[PDB]
Amino acid sequence: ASIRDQLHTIVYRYPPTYVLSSEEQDLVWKFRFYLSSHKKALTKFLKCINWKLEDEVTQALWMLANWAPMDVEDALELLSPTFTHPQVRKYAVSRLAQAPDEDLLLYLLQLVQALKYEDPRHIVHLHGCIFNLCTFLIQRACTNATLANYFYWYLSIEVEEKQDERAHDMYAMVLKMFLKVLENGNFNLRGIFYNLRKQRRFIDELVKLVKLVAKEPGNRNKKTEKFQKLLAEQDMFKVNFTNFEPIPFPLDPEIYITKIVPMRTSLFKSALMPAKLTFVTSIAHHEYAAIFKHGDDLRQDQLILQMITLMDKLLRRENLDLKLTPYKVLATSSKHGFLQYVDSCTVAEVLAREGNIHNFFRKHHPCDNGPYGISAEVMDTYIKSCAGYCVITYLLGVGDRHLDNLLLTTNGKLFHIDFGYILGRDPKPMPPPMKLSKEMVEAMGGISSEHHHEFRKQCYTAYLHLRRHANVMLNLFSLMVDATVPDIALEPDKAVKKVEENLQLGLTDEEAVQHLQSLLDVSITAVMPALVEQIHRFTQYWR
Amino acid sequence: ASIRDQLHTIVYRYPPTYVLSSEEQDLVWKFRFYLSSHKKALTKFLKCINWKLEDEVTQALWMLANWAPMDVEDALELLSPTFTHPQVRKYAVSRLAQAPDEDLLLYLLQLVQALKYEDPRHIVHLHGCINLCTFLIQRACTNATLANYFYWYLSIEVERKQDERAHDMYAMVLKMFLKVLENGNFNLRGIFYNLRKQRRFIDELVKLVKLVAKEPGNRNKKTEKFQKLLAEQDMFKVNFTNFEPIPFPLDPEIYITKIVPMRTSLFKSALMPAKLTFVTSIAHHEYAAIFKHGDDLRQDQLILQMITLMDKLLRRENLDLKLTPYKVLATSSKHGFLQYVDSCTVAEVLAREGNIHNFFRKHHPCDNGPYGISAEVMDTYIKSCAGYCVITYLLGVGDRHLDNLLLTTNGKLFHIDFGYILGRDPKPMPPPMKLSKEMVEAMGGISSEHHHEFRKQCYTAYLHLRRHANVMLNLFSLMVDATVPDIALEPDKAVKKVEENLQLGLTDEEAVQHLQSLLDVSITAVMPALVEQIHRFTQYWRK
Numbered sequence A: 001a002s003i004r005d006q007l008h009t010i011v012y013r014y015p016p017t018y019v020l021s022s023e024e025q026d027l028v029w030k031f032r033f034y035l036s037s038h039k040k041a042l043t044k045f046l047k048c049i050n051w052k053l054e055d056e057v058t059q060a061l062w063m064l065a066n067w068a069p070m071d072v073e074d075a076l077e078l079l080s081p082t083f084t085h086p087q088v089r090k091y092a093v094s095r096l097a098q099a100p101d102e103d104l105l106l107y108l109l110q111l112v113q114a115l116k117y118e119d120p121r122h123i124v125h126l127h128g129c130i131f132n133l134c135t136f137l138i139q140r141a142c143t144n145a146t147l148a149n150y151f152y153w154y155l156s157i158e159v160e161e162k163q164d165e166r167a168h169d170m171y172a173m174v175l176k177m178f179l180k181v182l183e184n185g186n187f188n189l190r191g192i193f194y195n196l197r198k199q200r201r202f203i204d205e206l207v208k209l210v211k212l213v214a215k216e217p218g219n220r221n222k223k224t225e226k227f228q229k230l231l232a233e234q235d236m237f238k239v240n241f242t243n244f245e246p247i248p249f250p251l252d253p254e255i256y257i258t259k260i261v262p263m264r265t266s267l268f269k270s271a272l273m274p275a276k277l278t279f280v281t282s283i284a285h286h287e288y289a290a291i292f293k294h295g296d297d298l299r300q301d302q303l304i305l306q307m308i309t310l311m312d313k314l315l316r317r318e319n320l321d322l323k324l325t326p327y328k329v330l331a332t333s334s335k336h337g338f339l340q341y342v343d344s345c346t347v348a349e350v351l352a353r354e355g356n357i358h359n360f361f362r363k364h365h366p367c368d369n370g371p372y373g374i375s376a377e378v379m380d381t382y383i384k385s386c387a388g389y390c391v392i393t394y395l396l397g398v399g400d401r402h403l404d405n406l407l408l409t410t411n412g413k414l415f416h417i418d419f420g421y422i423l424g425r426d427p428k429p430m431p432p433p434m435k436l437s438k439e440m441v442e443a444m445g446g447i448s449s450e451h452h453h454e455f456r457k458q459c460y461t462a463y464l465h466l467r468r469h470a471n472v473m474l475n476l477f478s479l480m481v482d483a484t485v486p487d488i489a490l491e492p493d494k495a496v497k498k499v500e501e502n503l504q505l506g507l508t509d510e511e512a513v514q515h516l517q518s519l520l521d522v523s524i525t526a527v528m529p530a531l532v533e534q535i536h537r538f539t540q541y542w543r
Numbered sequence B: 001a002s003i004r005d006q007l008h009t010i011v012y013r014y015p016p017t018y019v020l021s022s023e024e025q026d027l028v029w030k031f032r033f034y035l036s037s038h039k040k041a042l043t044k045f046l047k048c049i050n051w052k053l054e055d056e057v058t059q060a061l062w063m064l065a066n067w068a069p070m071d072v073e074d075a076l077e078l079l080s081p082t083f084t085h086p087q088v089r090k091y092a093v094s095r096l097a098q099a100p101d102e103d104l105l106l107y108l109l110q111l112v113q114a115l116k117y118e119d120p121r122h123i124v125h126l127h128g129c130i131n132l133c134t135f136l137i138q139r140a141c142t143n144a145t146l147a148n149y150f151y152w153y154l155s156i157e158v159e160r161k162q163d164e165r166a167h168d169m170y171a172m173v174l175k176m177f178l179k180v181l182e183n184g185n186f187n188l189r190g191i192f193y194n195l196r197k198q199r200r201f202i203d204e205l206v207k208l209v210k211l212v213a214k215e216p217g218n219r220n221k222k223t224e225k226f227q228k229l230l231a232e233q234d235m236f237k238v239n240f241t242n243f244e245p246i247p248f249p250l251d252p253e254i255y256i257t258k259i260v261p262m263r264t265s266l267f268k269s270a271l272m273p274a275k276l277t278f279v280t281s282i283a284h285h286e287y288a289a290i291f292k293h294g295d296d297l298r299q300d301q302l303i304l305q306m307i308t309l310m311d312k313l314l315r316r317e318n319l320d321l322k323l324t325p326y327k328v329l330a331t332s333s334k335h336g337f338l339q340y341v342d343s344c345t346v347a348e349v350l351a352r353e354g355n356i357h358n359f360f361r362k363h364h365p366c367d368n369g370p371y372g373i374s375a376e377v378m379d380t381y382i383k384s385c386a387g388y389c390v391i392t393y394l395l396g397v398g399d400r401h402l403d404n405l406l407l408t409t410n411g412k413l414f415h416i417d418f419g420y421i422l423g424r425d426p427k428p429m430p431p432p433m434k435l436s437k438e439m440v441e442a443m444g445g446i447s448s449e450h451h452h453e454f455r456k457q458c459y460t461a462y463l464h465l466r467r468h469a470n471v472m473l474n475l476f477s478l479m480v481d482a483t484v485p486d487i488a489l490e491p492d493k494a495v496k497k498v499e500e501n502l503q504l505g506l507t508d509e510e511a512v513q514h515l516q517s518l519l520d521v522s523i524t525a526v527m528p529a530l531v532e533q534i535h536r537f538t539q540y541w542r543k
Helices: A004-013 A024-032 A039-048 A054-066 A072-079 A087-100 A102-116 A120-130 A131-143 A145-159 A163-185 A186-215 A220-232 A297-319 A347-353 A357-364 A377-398 A438-443 A450-468 A472-481 A493-504 A511-529 A529-543 B004-012 B026-030 B040-049 B055-066 B073-081 B086-098 B101-114 B120-129 B132-142 B146-158 B164-183 B188-213 B220-230 B296-316 B346-354 B358-362 B375-395 B437-443 B449-467 B470-476 B485-489 B489-504 B506-526 B527-539
Strands: A256-260 A277-279 A285-294 A329-331 A337-340 A406-408 A412-417 B255-266 B274-280 B286-292 B328-332 B335-339 B404-406 B414-415
Touching: A004 A024, A004 A039, A024 A039, A039 A054, A039 A072, A054 A087, A054 B220, A072 A087, A072 A102, A072 A472, A087 A102, A102 A131, A102 A145, A102 A163, A102 A297, A102 A472, A120 A131, A120 A163, A131 A145, A131 B188, A145 A163, A145 A186, A145 A329, A163 A186, A186 A220, A220 B040, A297 A329, A297 A377, A297 A450, A297 A472, A329 B026, A337 B527, A347 A357, A347 A406, A347 A438, A357 A377, A377 A412, A377 A450, A377 A493, A377 A511, A377 B286, A412 B073, A438 A511, A438 B004, A450 A472, A450 A511, A472 A493, A511 A529, A511 B506, A511 B527, A529 B506, A529 B527, B004 B026, B004 B040, B026 B040, B040 B055, B055 B086, B073 B086, B073 B101, B073 B470, B086 B101, B086 B132, B086 B255, B101 B132, B101 B146, B101 B296, B101 B470, B120 B132, B120 B164, B132 B146, B132 B188, B146 B164, B146 B188, B146 B328, B188 B220, B188 B335, B220 B255, B296 B328, B296 B375, B296 B449, B296 B470, B346 B358, B346 B404, B346 B437, B358 B375, B358 B437, B375 B414, B375 B437, B375 B449, B375 B489, B375 B506, B437 B449, B470 B489, B485 B489, B506 B527
Parallel strands: none
Antiparallel strands: A256 A277, A277 A285, A285 A337, A329 A337, A406 A412, B255 B274, B274 B286, B286 B335, B328 B335, B404 B414
């Protein structure tokens, strides 16, 4: 019908986790038969059928075979715990199979959690065969070396020591099966297996060394000295850190390492003391650095970093480059991992060493002409980084921000780090909704500036695009409900709702921008002491 | 042609005071030939041609005469010093001829001011005889209320070294007008007889009032004296206890027979206003007015004309914000009349009845009513609030306090007194928007449905007025040499101050955002909970 279409388009194209559809179910259904407008339609169609009858199930399943094929993002929802039925799940797996590896890696973290939701019987039967989704992950991980790397590391965190007992047992089973398939396959499959073993041996020895450093009494500098001496001690360990045979790096399976440089290694002023390491690579003695951190479970951080990477990709697709830095994390075990090292200086360091951010930029990229005697791109990128981070931190509810927590680079970028507080948890009783240092606002030229205005403009458009891609972020959050990420595990059932609450999906675009602006304004006013003075004066007016 | 067609629609609909299109006006010239499309086309056309010297002129008039006739507002701009051509002004005055008497009444204040602009010759040759001055006179004679206001607006102005000659011109003009009335027919003679009747009365009331001031002492003492001077028959040229019916200078439709002495009271203000009760010719109806001896009232009367103009525009849009444009006229500098509306000051309401709701509750209590108040009173309150906030913002009205704002039993809120205009405040700060704390509680505070409607009403009033910006700007233009206190300090800046609050550069949503921002600061300042929250947010980055 003429209007019939709009009532339905709002349903295909707006609600994402809504149970909202009810009567709609009967109407979508009657129209379900004539027109599968979009893949988006299909996810919606699915919701009403499995509701009870088998007669309903048979008709719906046929509808599915012919329907315009779902997008991976929607397929993700299908692996979700809400839909029991074997045919829809086979279907979700077929949709992923169609996907390219790069896309598969992004989601993989979620797919590993997705495993929890499949029937154990499929997993036990495959175990029986060696001694769809699960067979699929193994089959594909074998196909491509970097995928295998991630698959392995994700499975290991899961396997190591109520319903947990059941889930651990399942993961243990997947790992034994994956490892046994690899040992057995050919040159290409065995090659993968040998490499994983080399990483496994290397990390264990690395862990032994860090523990010795941890034990040695002393301040940062004395411990770092002990750490440097240890690396250089050859054949005190099962591995010789000064030389080894090439091992694909767990953060980046693409780079082999072969060496560490004992004297280049530092420890962070951070309170857990991360090593930095340098390695050399298999190529032309290149360096890599990474961090190695031995205090917390990096899982919450990989989730957030995965989230930042995803958002960066979506904005980049729409031709919005907020110059974000989505660095790499893996955890090894809970309690160790790596993180990518990006050349950066924390804001507090910058403030203490140079008077203020502008001075810092100006030193690295002076341009007499302007904006502030700083080359424009640097100003432009600082502005974009700020807006991307401000919106992304708000959406994900990142708490516990401070001057140690934000960093800068020489190019301009700002980014965040250390995502221990997430989804509105904070060590302090307050917000602000938006997280901006007085220093960051001053860095922008203050309240009225070609640049500050530019910063707000960027937040709003960033916000609008992110809102549009709510389906993927929400589906991914849905799969992390039993995830063993601390902040999520406090009320698992509330986590997705909170992300969704921030997305402000009810509101119209014009309305949503006003909302962000509102949050932005309180935050900036409380941070700037003249604005607080102005409010003090206004109260004073009415007397 | 097509996109260039859009750039054309851009020039007509958007600005009234732009210097725009200098190299570009000849571009407008090119498509103007074929496109005397609509009225707004014209005002722009004239701006381009006339800047150049001698033949552009003859071509333009042929074009003008051929042009789809100009709207009356456009006409207002043509009277100004920006256009000095005799022909164009003739045309502008022909446009005025088209206008209804009511529209004339409105513009007539600015129309009187318009006279200051050329030509001096017209006045002197019409005087010699014994087309703008002529027009105004001819029409004053047609309409009795028109004539009334014309007379009063003239007599104030006749009561810098180069401003001294304008006075001369006003004088020449008033007397010509008065002479036409003397020499006129039955009807003109009648109006004239009535204007004179009004003078004597004004002078006799002035004498009485001066004598109340001459006596020194208490407020009760001065009222006693006032009552006695009114009751004293024939100690004055006019007997105030009863006199021959005269049309009220404030409201020419009403005639007055007498004043009631015992009913008169004096106002709280240090300079002490008198409230008079008048009896009218009809059904012993009574009229209440205020008579003020202290200050020149031209500033109050501009603001009220503007409030009245604005109300009409809104209501034409069928937005009735339930503003109250009480009529004001200044007889002379240092005395005039004010329409009186039965009202209670907000300070007065608050001291007498604890809070504002109690006041509304006293008069219109409904048990299922919002606040134990009738639903309609709460609505009329919200709307008046909204209306006034925006109008006050636009006109930059200062010196707001709780004696300045009064409430009716009906729920309307309105602003009483316009000492400070166009941004001037005795006090050093805004707030840009004026809301007492008590007013917001009266709405039931920020998290209420009424407060939301109030804001929603603000934005909407604002958007609409923006659309009618041209009328207001032109009205203001003709007020540059006005003899209003606040225009006189910065004549050149005055128009620009109103135009700036209109924010025409902004697109509609940006405009709404802008207004949200001002409302936000203004309301936070006032509410202590909102201030404390800012305290806590500031505290967040401290440690």
